Ligand binder design. Structure first.
Ligand code: HEC
Ligand SMILES: [Cl-]
Ligand SMILES: [Cl-]
Length: 104
C-alpha cells in the first residue's frame, strides 16, 4: 500500500480517537504502537471491552483488512464506534501506514 495516502486516511478517519507513536497517549481509543503481531486488547494501560479481549486474534495486515472494513461485524460489542472503510485500496494504504508508524 501507499504509506503517504494511508497517513492522510489515518489523520482524517482515526486520529480523533487514536495515536500511533511509541509512548503516545490513549484517547477514546488505545495508542496503537506495537499493534502488529499482538493479540487484541493488549495496549499497555488501556481498558478494553470484554468483547475486544475475547476476540483472541492477532493483529496483522489480513485481520486489520477485515476489521477496518466493518469493526462491529468483526468484534461484536466493541466500543469502537467507527463505520469502517469500504474501499479495499484505502484500507490497504491505511494499513501500510500503520505497519510503518506503529513499528517505529
Ligand atoms: C472513536 C470514535 C474511534 C475511531 C474514529 C476509531 N477508533 Fe479504533 N478504537 C476505538 C476504541 C474505543 C477502541 C477500543 C475498543 C474496545 O472494544 O475496547 C478501538 C480499538 C481499535 C483497535 C483494536 C486495538 C487492540 O485490540 O489493541 C484498532 C486496531 C483500531 N481501533 C484502529 C482504528 C483505526 C485504524 C481507525 C481509523 C480507521 C480507528 N480505529 C477509528 C475508537 C475509535
Ligand atoms: Cl465490557
Ligand atoms: Cl502482517
Amino acid at each position: 500500500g501507499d504509506v503517504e495516502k494511508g497517513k492522510r486516511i489515518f489523520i482524517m478517519k482515526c486520529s480523533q480517537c487514536h495515536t500511533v507513536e511509541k509512548g503516545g497517549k490513549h484517547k477514546t481509543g488505545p495508542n496503537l504502537h506495537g499493534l502488529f503481531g499482538r493479540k487484541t486488547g493488549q495496549a499497555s494501560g488501556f481498558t478494553y471491552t470484554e468483547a475486544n479481549k475475547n476476540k483472541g486474534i492477532i493483529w496483522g495486515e489480513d485481520t486489520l483488512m477485515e476489521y477496518l472494513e466493518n469493526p462491529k461485524k468483526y468484534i461484536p460489542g466493541t466500543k469502537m464506534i467507527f463505520v469502517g472503510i469500504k474501499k479495499k485500496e484505502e484500507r490497504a494504504d491505511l494499513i501500510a501506514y500503520l505497519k510503518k508508524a506503529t513499528n517505529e
